[PDB]
Every structure is written in C-alpha cells, then in structure tokens.
Structure 1
Amino acid sequence: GHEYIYVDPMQLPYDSRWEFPRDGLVLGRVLGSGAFGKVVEGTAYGLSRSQPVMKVAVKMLKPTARSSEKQALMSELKIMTHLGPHLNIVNLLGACTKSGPIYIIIEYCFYGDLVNYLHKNRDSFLGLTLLDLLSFTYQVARGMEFLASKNCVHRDLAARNVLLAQGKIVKICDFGLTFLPVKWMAPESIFDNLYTTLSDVWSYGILLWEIFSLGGTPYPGMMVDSTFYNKIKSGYRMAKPDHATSEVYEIMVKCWNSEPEKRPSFYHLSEIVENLLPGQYKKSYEKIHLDFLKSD
C-alpha cells in the first residue's frame, strides 16, 4: 500500500482557468470581517456568460497579512476547486492570483446569514412559515451530504455560516481551510479533539435548534465554564425549541447521541427531512438543481 497515497488538494497545481482580470472586478462595501480575512460586495464584468455584469463577494486578506496568511488563502482556493460545485454551498466563481494580493470571487447571497434573516422575520412568523424552516433544514442537509461526500469536514457548521441566496437557496460556506465554537461542537470534538463527519451532524442538530427557535442562542443563559462541560459529558441536551415539530426534535436528539456511530448520516438526514416536506418541494428542488448545473 506504499502504492495508494492520499491526494492532498493543496499540493495540486492551481488551475488558471479560474483566474480573472483585476480590471474586470470592482470591490465594494465590506460584508464580513474575520480575525484575518474579510469579504466584500463585488461587481464583476465579463466573469460570466450567463450574466455579463454580476454581483459577487470577494474574500481577501486583511491589510495586516503575514505571508503565512497568504498561503492559507491559496490553499482554500485549491480546496475549493477540488471540491467541485454544489447548489447548497457558496461556489467559487473566479480568483485573482497574479501581480497582487489574492482575491477569491464567491457567489453572492442576497439575504445573508440565516441568523439575521431569521431575526428579521421573527415577527412575520404568523410571512415566514414552517415550510420555510423545513426548506432550509433540507438544504443544509443536502449541502452537507455533498461536503461529506468529498470527505470534507466543515468544523464550524452553524447558522451564521448558512447563507440564503436569491431564490431562498441556502448556501453553506467556510468549508475551506484558537477560539472554538463550543456550543456547536460534538463532545469528542471538545474532549477528544476528534473532528469528523459524525461531529458535523452534531453541529447540524444544533443548527436546527437555531432555526426552529427562530434564531436562538444555543444553551441560553448558560455560560461555557466547568459546569457546562460537566453537563455535556453527563449527557445534557437542549429541550425542544418552541417552533419545532415533534418530528424534527426527534431529528436533533438523534444528532446528539453521545456515540458518534449512532448519529445519522447526512444522506440519511436529507431523507428524514424529505418525508417532512410536500412532494412538490422535492420536484422544485430537482429542477433548481438541474438549472444550477446548467448555469454558464
């Protein structure tokens, strides 16, 4: 087996088929700021056949960029290209890699992160409807089932990183390569430092609690501290959210099995959520899925 080796995307040569002109691209208002790294609204001219002028977002390093930070961006780009495109993740459109700082052009989602959108329509939720919640839950499952398929572990699945595009299509992000999102991590991920696809299912069960309580902080009123860990190890789990059907809560509780092997697959989760949804939505989703693959 000296023969079979692991193909590490970050070593494979960059594909310049991606590369896009910098006089073709206009920067814009900042959308989000990372510790290092930032995103921006963008306008690209000639980037797409489908749209001559289109609205993007660009990821760029902050001005204080150590070189090491510089490679991280390229690696993410290489990881992105390798992953391929899927409907439920924020796809790569182009990148600028020569004669300047690196820019990765990503899809732009009009609504924004699920947390803000949910807060906005909390009142309108009887208007935002239960099916709407179910629609998102299904596409978070589908997107992840794609990600796991590529052996990609997100490590930070949550609502702030679920985005809602035009067409109410949810796109996940930051799936590409310390303070840790403790409320969202599986036990093995906190105690054992084990990050896997089965621990992203945990985070997903936390994401649903986020959804169905219409944007509620996980473990509200509970501050992470020694007692919090002593609770989680002992098996403590959040109660049912107010707006979640008995059926869905069952879905979370499955996601929070102390044993990882016991947690359902994303592929499995897509299925459970599909039977919670009108048949016409599954039709709507496939037509949209085809159309996306046909864009450009």
Structure 2
Amino acid sequence: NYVYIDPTQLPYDHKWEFPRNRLSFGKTLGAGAFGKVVEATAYGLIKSDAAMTVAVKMLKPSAHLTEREALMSELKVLSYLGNHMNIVNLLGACTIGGPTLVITEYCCYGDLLNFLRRKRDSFICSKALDLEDLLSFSYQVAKGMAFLASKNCIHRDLAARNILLTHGRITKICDFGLARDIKNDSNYVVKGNARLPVKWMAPESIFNCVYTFESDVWSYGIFLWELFSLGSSPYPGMPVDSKFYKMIKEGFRMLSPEHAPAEMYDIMKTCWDADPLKRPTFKQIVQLIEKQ
C-alpha cells in the first residue's frame, strides 16, 4: 500500500555532521525524560573560526531503547522543519565516534517554565517580566505551533518546560522527542505502552490513544495555564490516577490563573473542549492573540 514519504522517518543527512572534538561542554542546561542538554562551544561551526555558544543534546547514560530512538527522531524532525524563528534551530549533530550529539542554537534564558519561576516574584504589568511579555510568549508559541501543523507535524509534548527563550523576548519550541508526522492519517495512535506527559494530554489521547492536530491544541492550553500562573504545575498536588482521569472525562478544568486576562482564559477553555472538533486551530489562536 501507498504512503506519503515521511520526511522525519528518512535515514539521516550527513550534512549536519560536526566533529565532536570541536565541541566543548560547559554547565548542564536541563534534562527532561528523554535527553540531557548541556551548554557548549562549537569551534568553527558556522564561520570557519566561530567559537559559537550552543546547546548540545545527548542521551543520558544508561538510557533505554525509547530514549535512544527518540533522540534520533528529533534530529530527523528538527532537520525537516529547518529554521523558523519560533522553533529551536538545529545546527548540527555528531553521530560518529561517540554518542549521538544533537547540536542546537543556544537559548540563553532556558525553558519558560524555569524562567517563569525565577521571575514570578517580580511580575508586574506595563513595565522584569511583563503581562505584554506573557502575551508575547502566547503569540509566539501559537505562531510556531501553527507552523508545525502546516508542516504536518504534531509536537506531542508542548509544555512550558519545552519552550525556550532567547534574547529579543523571542521564544523557541524544543523537545521533538515525541513529535510525529501526521500526513498519512492524522489520527496517530500510540503503540508502545509509553510513559507520556499525561497532565498535558487531551482526553482523546489518554483514553482512545489518538493524537491529532487539535490535540497539541489541548496541550497549548495547559501551557497558557502554565504561562499565566507564572509557572505553576498543572493540577498541583494532584496525582495521576483514576481520580484525575475521571475529572478530565466528566469535563472539569482548571480555573483562570490570577494573572491571566479574560481572553486568554477563554482561549485555554476552548482549547480544553472535550469535543476535539470544537477546539480552535493554532491558526485561529494566532489571530485570537493578535487582537490583544
């Protein structure tokens, strides 16, 4: 049978190869469930004499098959999407002579989540973290998410921790470890018995194992929630078990963060519709924010 040749499944381009002995490691930048990211210098990575600052991502030692496969999966994705201001810029990989190193544009402020909590105790509006800044990050992630979707991709792990921030208040989406290309169906079904970011997951994906374009929309909602609560954990104190699953199904949702404006809560909520086909598309979120 016939398939849309999936760009993110394609064997790998050796044009990204950058010799690892030209890299050097500084302090650790973060670590999620999949990889470890470390700060670095890449000598001669763009200009023959660069000394560029970068983020290098690599498997954590004693990583499993899943972690392994995923790191390659995001090399391949990052590759396919290419430069776009709001996605994380891929600049290289090292696959030869040591562990897979995935080289990324360094974002100097880190994950919104962490950034939010360092600057929560300093939040104001009209000017330091702004309300305009929070709006600005809402716009930029929706903008970037609307871009993935046009490129037939679903992130599958949109969360505050997987959004980076660089200098011009410019935000970059990262962690394409769970991202898949959806052109073939849309309804992408999770095969593995997986270990997933459940509190960011739309009910249809939890219960019926189906992710769609409008299921990143759900997570983007939990992310507007993270954004405007100045970095709170979703459903704080709430373990993921039957009590949590049941409150999602029966349709219960989080309240407005004390710092969210009415229209942003309104978007979140429509992002949280039980009916997948009632949620707005990021394209519509984008335009919903540009009226603010």
TM-score category (smaller protein)? 0.7 to 0.9
Structure 1, unmatched stretches of 5+, are 277-296
Question: Is contact 1:94-1:105 (8 Å) kept?
Answer: yes
Map of 2:182 onto structure 1: none
Question: Is contact 1:152-1:175 (8 Å) kept?
Answer: no
**Structure 1 residues 24 and 257, CA gap change in structure 2 (3 angstroms):** same
**Structure 1 residues 13 and 222, CA gap change in structure 2 (3 angstroms):** closer
Q: Equivalent residues in 2 for 1:141-160 (5 A)?
A: 141-160=142-161
Partners of 2:254 and 2:152 in 1: CA distance:
29
Partners of 1:245 and 1:68 in 2: CA distance:
40
Question: Is contact 1:28-1:40 (8 Å) kept?
Answer: yes
Which of the numbers 249, 257, 260 marks the counterpart of 2:273? 257
Question: Is contact 2:78-2:88 (8 Å) kept?
Answer: no
**Structure 1 residues 75 and 241, CA gap change in structure 2 (3 angstroms):** closer
AA at the equivalent of 2:152? N
Map of 2:181 onto structure 1: none
**Structure 1 residues 213 and 35, CA gap change in structure 2 (3 angstroms):** closer
For the pair 1:243 / 2:243, whether they are aligned, the reply is no
Please list the CA deviations of residues 50-99 of structure 1 after superposition, one character each: whole Å capped at 9, or x if unmatched. 98221101111233256775454333212221222211111111111223
Q: Count residues with an aligned counterpart.
A: 274
Partners of 2:49 and 2:134 in 1: CA distance:
30
Map of 1:115 onto structure 2: 113
Map of 1:164 onto structure 2: 165
Partners of 1:209 and 1:45 in 2: CA distance:
40
Secondary structure at the aligned position of 2:14 is classed as coil
Map of 2:214 onto structure 1: 198
Question: Is contact 1:153-1:175 (8 Å) kept?
Answer: no
Q: C-alpha displacement at 1:255, in angstroms?
A: 0.5
User: Rg larger in 1 or in 2?
Assistant: 1
Please list the CA deviations of residues 19-72 of structure 1 after superposition, one character each: whole Å capped at 9, or x if unmatched. 112232112222223445311111011112398221101111233256775454
Question: Is contact 1:88-1:169 (8 Å) kept?
Answer: yes
Partners of 2:9 and 2:257 in 1: CA distance:
44
AA at the equivalent of 2:79? T
Partners of 1:50 and 1:231 in 2: CA distance:
56
Question: Is contact 2:71-2:177 (8 Å) kept?
Answer: no
AA at the equivalent of 1:167? G
AA at the equivalent of 1:266? F
Please list the CA deviations of residues 220-264 of structure 1 after superposition, one character each: whole Å capped at 9, or x if unmatched. 343332222222111111111111111111111110111111100
Partners of 1:236 and 1:52 in 2: CA distance:
52
TM-score normalised by length of structure 1? 0.86
Which of the numbers 183, 206, 209 marks the counterpart of 2:225? 209
TM-score normalised by length of structure 2? 0.87
**Structure 1 residues 159 and 66, CA gap change in structure 2 (3 angstroms):** closer
